[model samples]
Target: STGSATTTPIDSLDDAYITPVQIGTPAQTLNLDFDTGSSDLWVFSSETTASEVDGQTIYTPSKSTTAKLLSGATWSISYGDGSSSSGDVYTDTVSVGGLTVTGQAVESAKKVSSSFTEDSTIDGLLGLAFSTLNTVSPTQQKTFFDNAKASLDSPVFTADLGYHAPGTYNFGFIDTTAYTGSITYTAVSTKQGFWEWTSTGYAVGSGTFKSTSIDGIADTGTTLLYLPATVVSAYWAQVSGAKSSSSVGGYVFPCSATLPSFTFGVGSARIVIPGDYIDFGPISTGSSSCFGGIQSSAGIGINIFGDVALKAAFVVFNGATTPTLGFASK
Candidate 1:
């Protein structure tokens, strides 16, 4: 039973770096993956064949003179590290910053291998988080915030993940004037279907959640917010110098100097986890001080709440203002 720690470096694969998007209206750039878990927004087509892709970037719709193709829809995606990609399915007209949206929903991966053909800079993947685990067709899944949430000026989609600082994680339009009050309601569940609910117990740093307060699942396409090892050792035992070492698994520590300020309690809302995202960067074994971020999964199941808890709150999914799910903040 350990808690209270501080020491970084433990990240190893999620790439965590690669941004350069621009889709339709004469913009085709692609290299994405700023995912919050899954919403589906892929690229890499032109019937891909750069020697079967070895590095990454491959979206040659004749080099986008305006790339467009979907006749006969057929798409494929499979990731959990198993790696997969299938092609066919189109509807171009996209853009990122200046904001252009038209018939989005595009995927193209004609049998890619070489770990996804290659990576010129890796273009494709900007889920932004939450669309119900979308993979394109449910009838062309509501892509890019349901097609730019009515010309977005305020339909809302802001996801600024500046963990180290570069912020701006927007999606469609959430500018609810940044938020001040009146926004606390949670009643959406299908158990594991995207916008889930049920969490009355959970408290780290202050060590709450007594011991048996189950049912918790909120996923912005998962970035890391898993619990249940007696609630991650009773919420890292109040983190004063939270210690635990030997890598690969045992992370979270303390007194490397002084880095203790944890908070976790989703319901009345506390969600804090940020010591540089709890250190976590190196992972093989050499135990670099440890507690880079609580890690230990007793049979891992449910309890997701990713994107480090939706980047601290400002979430809303009103399929038209009533399916319920609105957590505001700035």
Candidate 2:
């Protein structure tokens, strides 16, 4: 049977969208971040040290009858933002919405970095990238989607992330009623364990679209859009009082600057990112300076179409053959 789940904004932070997931027998519910950039379903658990637990929810395997230890299996992951978690593995039933997968590997964290322990709202992360990226040792683990795909009507899911608003994640089916206009699809390259694709080009404001090709990944977990240094510099140059801030990092500008709209090319279809969205809130509370949501992806190798870009359009993460990306205007 097809299933759908609602994802709500954690706060005015506008960082990531989280959904409820049930793990183990009798179903212990936890709010998990559905990240499209990495693959590994892990959670804060009783295995975690009390000092590292903080205010996050924990999953207890001993309390679940169906929980079984995956002998000698361990997992460790480090995110681009420096957050990390590591733990042993446990096999149990995991459910999302009405869809359930048996014998799913759930990593129980024994160690977590400050970035995770401080984020009291995020109990764990549900990786949606690809099973190949799973970190379990001895035997790699399959993602919840990989195990549940065969049971689904179609091997696909749609991400409808909203800006400070509620959105929905649909599995096995696409809801045409959720988006306007037609969906434009582009071929995806999963070589790096990500939904990577090359854009036809981009433009600023009503400017002509350039044919420069940019290879990048669609990451729902990332908070902002990251592009090539040249592209980021060009966009910031258009805004008066915008400059690279050594203190604040990346580029910062006066809060009152009138920013220009940014557009990315996807085949013949153009996905536009509004100017106001680029003003990523104040640098600090009551401060007149603001940080840009779009930054340079210099050290990061590939560009990232983070939440700022994803929320501006409807996205379809097709796990079918070829793994294409379908975009539509919201």
Candidate 3:
């Protein structure tokens, strides 16, 4: 017997709204984000002492019969907002669905900022995005595709967004039936840590914004969409009582019922975001309202399509083929 045969109980396919991807064999499971912004697999350890580790499933190296921690390798990741986490590297027998992969590298965060500590459920992220933005050396780095590449049903890794409602984001197994035809794959730019691209423009409800051709980046690591000033002004012009007050970093708006629907165009694909996500209430005093969907980016001359826009479509990552993002309705 492999010591205690404690098989991790996972909810049914229907109830398990979030993508409960496998890591550490069939016994241990770790939910992850298929991010395009970065590449690295880091999980919350059973040893984490963060205040928000209540419901998160932590990895215990002892449970796995074949687990190895790299003696000298240490890693850290810093988000655009300055939040970060640091940990040592480890490897163990890992699995996802019926595909089993062994000796996978993962980071175990020993030190984390308060911002990262507050996020519910998972303590860390498993980036299944592209290799271009990988924190580790590209030669040694392995993404979800790196392991599952040979066994994919199709040459694609699909995100089932409709399967997970509200706050959950899901990934794995592209459903050919869900798409209209074959997906139009967009090649990734040869950049480091930044997945840059161009957007057609913005639209309110059905009408398009003044400037339709804008270059930007699609980032799963970011929570909100960062837009240009012209786009923000044109969007808020239609939003009633939408005024910018003194904010911490970016534009802050008061929560009002007058906010309207906003849509962003990526080439010919149009993504619509609900108004409710625009009003993220202050978690504490001095903390301004986080206009979730649309906001003003200082002047980076780029836009970040965050969770708000990402959730609206079923995103497919075909990293095994070409660096491509395939979008479809769930």
Candidate 4:
């Protein structure tokens, strides 16, 4: 079986993307962020302190007859910014698009950080990463994809992230028309429970492609494309008035400066990101300088191909035994 869902960016900056999900017999629909970086289907639930939940919808387990408490089961996860959440776990009927999965682990949040409390748009996260990263105690739970793969005709899912607009996520089947040219494939390493892979090369604008071995993960939860400092510096060097600003926290340049398009490879196919996409808007409202969408992954260890990069291509997360990532320009 196959399914499809609509996703939209939460803000003008495309900080995060959300999709509608139905849970339980009498559905309680919630807008959840589909993240490929983590493996925990958590939600803002009735158990969460009211103070922690502002305008976001809450998932009330008590209201669903199919919802059952996973006895003594608990889970907690932390974010890069120190924002975290901890809660009890529940097994319930959860559905994405029209495809259903029974006994899906639904982590109900009891405590959330101040950052989450203030962010009113995201109700929760639906993790698509490997189940190995599930943080549930005593017994780890499989992700929604892991459970659905057995039933999925193709054992795959895809992310067609948009730039400040609604996008589509397809499960089990590929929408061949959604992309242009042939999809180039590359081996994926789930070593760290991420859709981690390597790119064969990169090019600045119409420049020659440098066959560089760049290791990174295709993370939907992240907002920026983080590359090695050298790669980042190479990009900024092509733009006038561009400089690494300590106060700006990264490379920033005059908003009026021209930016060259950025391109990377998935085998022989090139996924090119427009220059405007790299101009992540002004650092501040009406500010003359803007931040670069492609920043340094210096401190973060490996490069991170986040939404900034993903939105430029059609991405496939194949869950088959011989897992591979497929990319196409759209």
Q: Give the per-residue lDDT of model 1 (tens digit) for 69-153.
A: 6666666667544566666766777666556666777677666545555544555565644565666543545556667766654
Model 3 agreement with the true structure over 192-252: per-residue lDDT tens digits = 4445666667787656554466666666655667887778777777766565655455555
Model 1 stretches with alpha carbons more than 4 Å out: 1-54, 63-102, 105-122, 129-143, 148-202, 205-285, 294-305, 308-318, 326-330
lDDT for position 257 in model 1? 34
Clashes of 3: 1
Worst 10 residues of 4 by lDDT: 78-87
* TM-score to true structure, per model: 0.33, 0.97, 0.78, 0.98
Against the true structure, candidate 1 has what lDDT?
0.55
Write one digit per residue (lDDT tens) for candidate 2, span 151-191.
99999988998877889888999999999999999999988
**Tens-place lDDT digits, model 4, residues 30-112:** 99999998899999999999889999999999999999999999999997647899999999999999889999999999999
Clashing pairs in 3: 200-212
Q: Alpha carbon lDDT of residue 129, candidate 4?
A: 88
Worst 10 residues of 1 by lDDT: 1-10
Q: Which should have the higher lDDT, number 3 or number 4?
A: 4
- Error (Å) of candidate 2 at residue 11 is 1.9
